[PDB]
């Protein structure tokens, strides 16, 4: 309330200085208390009619989500990432969406994300680790075998195939 | 209006029917059609008068006098009327109504009743006449085509693979092919018997063309049978050549594109769209040769009589 | 019973198998249940083999001889299976009742029923009381005696569970119903004799505050004028008016009744004299004179009415005011296990909600020490709601008894319904809820958006939207949709939350409840789901449906504006889900619920059959045309087709994943949505 009351009468030049100070604070420390206080302030300003805090020419969705991820407040991260998706989808946002949903005990949402990716981004943009994240150990094995066929011996694909085999329990092929 | 060797007209939601001169383009006369839209217009073979089909009634205006309001009216039907036709002798009129019935009317006999009726399942979209003027083709929303014989009174049925609405169909003037279009954008073509009348009607499908990616709204053959036009809701009008069924030209307006009419020699094309304007294009060059405007609302129906 | 089907060579084999299974271990419940159900099947197979063959002397006698060997084992097995359940046994009880009111007249089946009815507890009959009073006056002679005896026995103990429906039946136009009800009430009298009188007085007084003279007239005259002036129906006009003139004859018995009579009695009496002049003269001017007087009355009430905002009991019903410490339990609270709670007194004032129907807001003070609020409706039949609530309870139990559904908290929200007559009733009051219409109206007025923006755009584009053809309508619908944003509900739901970690749970609950009630409503045939017929909680997001008048595809066959939709699924509802779309919680929850329903088809088909075969309600179906047995058979066949997957082509048999997809495709179509009545809001 004090912040809102003060901010309303400030001059355009004093507001930018305060915003710069807040940005410096958000980046600098990992203090759990300061970060939580500033996140709560941002949320409160969002709910009001004065408009959200204008941080860094973007309203700070990226920075706020990144900082909320470390603070272990996953709902805020999901909200900010969902705003990011609406501005524009890219194959890099879907992976973060899947991971955040997994951290929140919601497999069905991740399955829906994969279905959307399948419908809207063809095949070349699909990676074999997304299946691993969803515990679909058979499609991951199929994709890894297909990849290892074309490409030569690369350690990462071999490790991924071994990891996929371990979960199912195929001791024979794994030992071979 | 009727003095010129070409008559052109268009209509839509604004309750007005307007006539245009093709050579340079300017309005010459307007008629009022209050209380409903217009679904189709047609000029009689006698080159005198015109018929407009709308909601629950069919009205006829005159071309030679240019003074008078409706001369003949047909009223007392249910729902919309989707099509209108005429016999080359100018004695019978065929209509495929919305309420699942096709009807025949007599022009000179002023008894307000249809001579013959023929009922089918699902509403009717399009009706067409065989060149011999002895058979009738009917399409319905259920995805089925019906063939009806006027002299023997028996009918037969057909159904392509999809159970989707048929939007239009037409038989070229020399009875060599017959084509139809469905709402999935696909078109189907069938070969026909050489002679017309007293024929087995050996309808065998040559092939289907995936002409469009959205709804198709009409299709017509050229008077010379060389070309086949196809409109659509994807702002594209495609022309195919009958010798090989391959694309020749593709006109675009990037509202939908509703109407389509050819010239007496397959030189021009006249098209209407939902953007309140009509366009006259050259078939070969594929460039807009002229434009007609003045309507306040969209234009849905068109008529072009290039004969005298 | 697979790879074979049902025949005349297979039935003996499987009966042998099940009999051996019962013999080897005479305590398993499943064995007896299966044996009884198998016997019940055989009987229904030899009937449709006769209707299909016989219809399309010795035959009937042979049928009597052959069919009198499957019914008695069925009854015995059903009774023994009931004995071993002691809990979820609704299906067996309904099956027993179905057999009873179809083959009781036969002598030996009556012997088996008489024997069985003694050995069962009396608590097994308290869940089928609504289905027993419907047949209180059966023509057959051997059924009514046993029904009366069982109803009397249900009266000695647990009497609080019989007074309301019996009182409702006691005041009926048909003579036999009220005769039987009065006989049973007489038999009950020597147990209490105060509870009965209190119940009758309370019911009479309540059925009266519900509708007042000015109101009955404000509508009677409306209806009578429509009949005469609109439809030229003089007979019908008189049939509305004659009863209203008669009623005032009884003579005022409360203050308000007298003041109407003082204001309008002379004018109405004179209007009747003009009508009676017409009866002798045949001169229509005399009816015109009467209508001049009736119109004068109608306008005065029309302007008097809108200012009635509350009612005081002292001018309406002093009888209720004098009531103190009754022995009658609060409506819709009796449970044979918990202690009883009685009504201490009634509050003195009633608040009238401002609407067309003008329902009241009654409140009672219980002996426990808490208030109970109710909604008192008049001019509305409320029995189809009772039946639907029983069905919803069954489905809730089915969902609760499964692990996958249990881990998700899938259920249906229900309320309390208590009929009082053929016209009025009581409904429980649900707190923290608001219709969608109200929420969108408030949001759009706060943000200053035109409330009819989409319709205004549609009309501007073409002012003939109601008469255009199909392809013409779809273009206009698409144009209207593409030039507007449909994110009001999502934005409103975000704003109305305190934090960001509560919004998540609320959204989850919203989605899952929507999916569950969509899947159930598809099978039930429910329709007429415009935005005013569903509400939304605040502390949670769970959705709630109401107004279950239409069922069994009644709205898909009407003549004007027939629906083409299985359930409501529009863009505003979809946008409020997760950003990706329908392929998340919604589709998987639909899969789960449809699987559960498909596993237990027998119970659902038991409940729905008893419901459709009740003669007091079949009126909802035959009215669709412009005999009834054939319609009931068709309805049940359609329900079976739905529950077996053979609902799009009788030749195929779809799996759940495939059917759900077809349903979702059918619901979200522009061709189907463009045809809806404009009051349905097909754009929200
Ligand atoms: N058959 C049948 N009706 C029912 C009504 C309720 C019910 N509804 N509401 C809100 C409410 C109450 C009254 C009105 C409206 C909304 C909308 C406007 N309106 C109109 O009359 C014009 C509208 O077109 C009056 C409740 N609030 C608390 N507890 C409840 N149980 C309810 C429940 C079950 C019902 O079952």
Author numbering:
A (entry chain A): 1320 to 1495
B (entry chain C): 8 to 261, 271 to 324
C (entry chain A): 1759 to 1814, 1867 to 2436, 2492 to 2549
Question: What does the study report here?
Answer:
Rapamycin and a structurally related immuno-suppressive natural product FK-506 (tacrolimus) 2(16,17) bind to a family of FK binding proteins (FKBP), which catalyze cis–trans isomerization of proline amide bonds found in peptides. The most abundant FKBP in the cytoplasm is a 12 kDa protein termed FKBP12.21 FK-506 bound to FKPB12 mediates immunosuppressive activity by binding to calcineurin and preventing translocation of Nuclear factor of activated T-cells (NFAT) into the nucleus. Thereafter, independent studies identified a mammalian homologue of TOR.25−27 In time, this homologue became known as mammalian Target of Rapamycin (mTOR) or, more recently, mechanistic Target of Rapamycin. As previously outlined, mTORC1 associates with auxiliary protein Raptor (149 kDa) while mTORC2 associates with the auxiliary proteins Rictor (192 kDa) and Sin1. To address these limitations, we have developed a novel class of “bi-steric inhibitors” that interact with both the orthosteric and the allosteric binding sites in order to deepen the inhibition of mTORC1 while also preserving selectivity for mTORC1 over mTORC2.
The C32-hydroxy rapamycin core was also combined with the “rigid-MLN” active-site ligand to give bi-steric inhibitor RMC-5552 38 (entry 4). We employed cryogenic electron microscopy (cryo-EM) to determine the structure of the mTORC1-RMC-5552-FKBP12 complex. After postprocessing, a final monomeric map of 2.9 Å was used for modeling. The maps also demonstrate the presence of FKBP12, whose recruitment would only be observed in the presence of the FKBP12-FRB allosteric modality of RMC-5552 38. In addition, density for RMC-5552 38 is evident at the interface between FKBP12 and the FRB domain of mTOR. FKBP12 and the macrocycle interact with the FRB domain of mTOR with the same binding mode and in a similar orientation as observed in the crystal structures described in Figure 4. The ATP-competitive, orthosteric site also shows unambiguous density in the map. RMC-5552 38 makes hydrogen bonds to the backbone of G2238 and V2240, the “hinge” of mTOR, via the 4-aminopyrazolo[3,4-d]pyrimidine core, and the 2-aminobenzoxazole makes hydrogen-bonding interactions to E2190 and K2187. The strong densities at both the ATP-competitive and the allosteric sites suggest that both sites are simultaneously occupied by RMC-5552 38 in the sample. Unsurprisingly, no density is observed for the flexible PEG linker, and it is not modeled.
